[PDB]
Enzyme design. Structure first.
Site, PDB file in Angstrom:
ATOM      1  N   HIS A 142     -21.423  44.944 -29.640  1.00  0.00           N
ATOM      2  CA  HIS A 142     -21.715  45.010 -31.079  1.00  0.00           C
ATOM      3  C   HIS A 142     -22.568  43.806 -31.464  1.00  0.00           C
ATOM      4  O   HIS A 142     -23.659  43.947 -32.009  1.00  0.00           O
ATOM      5  CB  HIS A 142     -20.414  45.026 -31.906  1.00  0.00           C
ATOM      6  CG  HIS A 142     -20.605  44.815 -33.388  1.00  0.00           C
ATOM      7  ND1 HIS A 142     -20.393  45.811 -34.319  1.00  0.00           N
ATOM      8  CD2 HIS A 142     -20.955  43.710 -34.095  1.00  0.00           C
ATOM      9  CE1 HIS A 142     -20.621  45.332 -35.534  1.00  0.00           C
ATOM     10  NE2 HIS A 142     -20.960  44.056 -35.429  1.00  0.00           N
ATOM     11  N   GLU A 143     -22.090  42.612 -31.158  1.00  0.00           N
ATOM     12  CA  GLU A 143     -22.823  41.440 -31.618  1.00  0.00           C
ATOM     13  C   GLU A 143     -24.170  41.225 -30.871  1.00  0.00           C
ATOM     14  O   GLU A 143     -25.161  40.841 -31.483  1.00  0.00           O
ATOM     15  CB  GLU A 143     -21.917  40.201 -31.699  1.00  0.00           C
ATOM     16  CG  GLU A 143     -20.853  40.285 -32.854  1.00  0.00           C
ATOM     17  CD  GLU A 143     -21.475  40.300 -34.262  1.00  0.00           C
ATOM     18  OE1 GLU A 143     -22.374  39.461 -34.467  1.00  0.00           O
ATOM     19  OE2 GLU A 143     -21.099  41.132 -35.166  1.00  0.00           O
ATOM     20  N   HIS A 146     -26.835  43.179 -32.545  1.00  0.00           N
ATOM     21  CA  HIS A 146     -27.463  42.529 -33.707  1.00  0.00           C
ATOM     22  C   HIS A 146     -28.752  41.823 -33.275  1.00  0.00           C
ATOM     23  O   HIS A 146     -29.726  41.786 -34.019  1.00  0.00           O
ATOM     24  CB  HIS A 146     -26.531  41.501 -34.372  1.00  0.00           C
ATOM     25  CG  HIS A 146     -25.435  42.099 -35.210  1.00  0.00           C
ATOM     26  ND1 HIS A 146     -25.665  43.058 -36.177  1.00  0.00           N
ATOM     27  CD2 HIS A 146     -24.104  41.838 -35.252  1.00  0.00           C
ATOM     28  CE1 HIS A 146     -24.517  43.380 -36.757  1.00  0.00           C
ATOM     29  NE2 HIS A 146     -23.554  42.651 -36.221  1.00  0.00           N
ATOM     30  N   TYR A 157     -29.597  42.072 -43.798  1.00  0.00           N
ATOM     31  CA  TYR A 157     -28.140  42.127 -43.751  1.00  0.00           C
ATOM     32  C   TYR A 157     -27.505  42.167 -45.142  1.00  0.00           C
ATOM     33  O   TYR A 157     -26.727  41.283 -45.519  1.00  0.00           O
ATOM     34  CB  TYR A 157     -27.580  40.960 -42.934  1.00  0.00           C
ATOM     35  CG  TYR A 157     -26.202  41.235 -42.374  1.00  0.00           C
ATOM     36  CD1 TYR A 157     -26.016  42.182 -41.371  1.00  0.00           C
ATOM     37  CD2 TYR A 157     -25.092  40.535 -42.830  1.00  0.00           C
ATOM     38  CE1 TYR A 157     -24.753  42.440 -40.846  1.00  0.00           C
ATOM     39  CE2 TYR A 157     -23.826  40.783 -42.312  1.00  0.00           C
ATOM     40  CZ  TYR A 157     -23.662  41.737 -41.326  1.00  0.00           C
ATOM     41  OH  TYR A 157     -22.406  41.971 -40.810  1.00  0.00           O
ATOM     42  N   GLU A 166     -24.896  47.043 -39.382  1.00  0.00           N
ATOM     43  CA  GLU A 166     -23.525  47.081 -38.860  1.00  0.00           C
ATOM     44  C   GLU A 166     -23.206  48.348 -38.057  1.00  0.00           C
ATOM     45  O   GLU A 166     -22.616  48.272 -36.972  1.00  0.00           O
ATOM     46  CB  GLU A 166     -22.503  46.899 -39.994  1.00  0.00           C
ATOM     47  CG  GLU A 166     -22.243  45.433 -40.312  1.00  0.00           C
ATOM     48  CD  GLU A 166     -21.589  44.736 -39.128  1.00  0.00           C
ATOM     49  OE1 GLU A 166     -20.629  45.328 -38.593  1.00  0.00           O
ATOM     50  OE2 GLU A 166     -22.034  43.636 -38.713  1.00  0.00           O
ATOM     51  N   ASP A 226     -18.809  41.130 -49.368  1.00  0.00           N
ATOM     52  CA  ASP A 226     -19.217  41.496 -48.016  1.00  0.00           C
ATOM     53  C   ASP A 226     -20.694  41.878 -47.981  1.00  0.00           C
ATOM     54  O   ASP A 226     -21.074  42.870 -47.367  1.00  0.00           O
ATOM     55  CB  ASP A 226     -18.340  42.645 -47.511  1.00  0.00           C
ATOM     56  CG  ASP A 226     -18.637  43.034 -46.073  1.00  0.00           C
ATOM     57  OD1 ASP A 226     -19.052  42.167 -45.278  1.00  0.00           O
ATOM     58  OD2 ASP A 226     -18.447  44.224 -45.743  1.00  0.00           O
ATOM     59  N   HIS A 231     -19.788  45.893 -43.928  1.00  0.00           N
ATOM     60  CA  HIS A 231     -18.747  46.277 -42.968  1.00  0.00           C
ATOM     61  C   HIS A 231     -17.912  47.433 -43.508  1.00  0.00           C
ATOM     62  O   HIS A 231     -17.009  47.920 -42.833  1.00  0.00           O
ATOM     63  CB  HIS A 231     -17.800  45.106 -42.661  1.00  0.00           C
ATOM     64  CG  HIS A 231     -18.440  43.984 -41.904  1.00  0.00           C
ATOM     65  ND1 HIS A 231     -18.962  42.870 -42.527  1.00  0.00           N
ATOM     66  CD2 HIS A 231     -18.645  43.806 -40.576  1.00  0.00           C
ATOM     67  CE1 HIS A 231     -19.460  42.052 -41.613  1.00  0.00           C
ATOM     68  NE2 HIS A 231     -19.283  42.598 -40.423  1.00  0.00           N
TER      69      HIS A 231
HETATM   70 ZN   LIG Z   1     -21.456  42.485 -36.965  1.00  0.00          ZN
END
Ligand SMILES: [Zn+2]
Ligand SMILES: [Ca+2]
Ligand SMILES: [Ca+2]
Ligand SMILES: [Ca+2]
Ligand SMILES: [Ca+2]
Length: 316
Positions: A142-143, A146, A157, A166, A226, A231
């Protein structure tokens, strides 16, 4: 560092033994020279200065409790590198074999992991909400995704572009988990989330509502928390991707599933050829439809399924 490539052995966060690529020069370093321009893993030593020290070990054996998060960060970065190269013909996150750097033991009781624009960073968790986050292959992928996104679509973002950002990371994190083929699912972070509670996770792609995330555009969060719910509203796109892959009927709209591999191709093409920093959900739908058209033809089941999926989550 300059040294000779070697192979160490250790145990990851979940107690599983694995081989890791290291480099020998007096000490054995967590430096994998076998992938692109290297994968490097660092010790942040419970502080927040980055990246910290390149991980050094006296004997090339990594079985200490303190070693576990490093073992997994290093190994799963390698799996994610392999996924992008083997499946999408992409060499590292920038497509030009950029070095992949990760720091573990970030801060104290830090319940998160993130790409900081230059490298991966992993908290150890507080032992209640999380155990060390590099233990989750979906979290690692996941990261790192990015980074791929930052080098490609560059989705801002915030708000809808942020939620797409996301979702892309959840989608590819999940596809990498399936690629590694160890207890794969459509949940996010289940391997490192709440050791005291079985069967849960941070988010669900198959049923975002399970954790109070919207599974329909009509339920989108429009507040400011957020970063405009990046998210949260990702659930709408996560559900669409799940439907494209696995099929189902959602609020009475039926979707014919086309499988994970084709999901991956369509979204990778969308991400790299069509999406832009300011893309919204409607524009993602168009990008995915065009991608599926490129890959499979306008009259294909694949295109029809993409349309059904976005219809099902109320994205026109
Ligand atoms: Zn993330
Ligand atoms: Ca050792
Ligand atoms: Ca799993
Ligand atoms: Ca998972
Ligand atoms: Ca749990």
């Amino acid at each position: 560092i300059t040294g000779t490539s070697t192979v160490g052995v250790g145990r990851g966060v979940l107690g599983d033994q694995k081989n890791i690529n290291t480099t020998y020069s007096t000490y054995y370093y967590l430096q994998d020279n076998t992938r692109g321009n290297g994968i490097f893993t660092y010790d942040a030593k419970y502080r927040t200065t980055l990246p910290g020290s390149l991980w050094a070990d006296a004997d090339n054996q990594f079985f200490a409790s303190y070693d576990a998060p490093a073992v997994d960060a290093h190994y799963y970065a390698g799996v994610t590198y392999d996924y992008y190269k083997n499946v999408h013909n992409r060499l590292s996150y920038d497509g030009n074999n950029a070095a992949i750097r990760s720091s573990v033991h970030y801060s104290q009781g830090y319940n998160n992991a993130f790409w900081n624009g230059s490298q991966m960073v992993y908290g150890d968790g507080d032992g209640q909400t999380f155990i060390p986050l590099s233990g989750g292959i979906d979290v690692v992928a996941h990261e790192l995704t990015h980074a791929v996104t930052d080098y490609t679509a560059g989705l801002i973002y915030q708000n809808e572009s942020g939620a797409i950002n996301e979702a892309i990371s959840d989608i590819f994190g999940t596809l990498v988990e399936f690629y590694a083929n160890k207890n794969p699912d459509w949940e996010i972070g289940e391997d490192v989330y709440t050791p005291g509670i079985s069967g849960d996770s941070l988010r669900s792609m198959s049923d975002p509502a399970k954790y109070g995330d919207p599974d329909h555009y009509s339920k989108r969060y429009t507040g400011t928390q957020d970063n405009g719910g990046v998210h949260i509203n990702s659930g709408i796109i996560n559900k669409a991707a799940y439907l494209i892959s696995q099929g189902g009927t959602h609020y009475g709209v039926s979707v014919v599933g086309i499988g994970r591999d084709k999901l991956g191709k369509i979204f990778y093409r969308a991400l790299t050829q069509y999406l832009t920093p300011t893309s919204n959900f409607s524009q993602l739908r168009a990008a995915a439809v065009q991608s599926a058209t490129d890959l499979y033809g306008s009259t294909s089941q694949e295109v029809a399924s993409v349309k059904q999926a976005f219809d099902a989550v109320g994205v026109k």
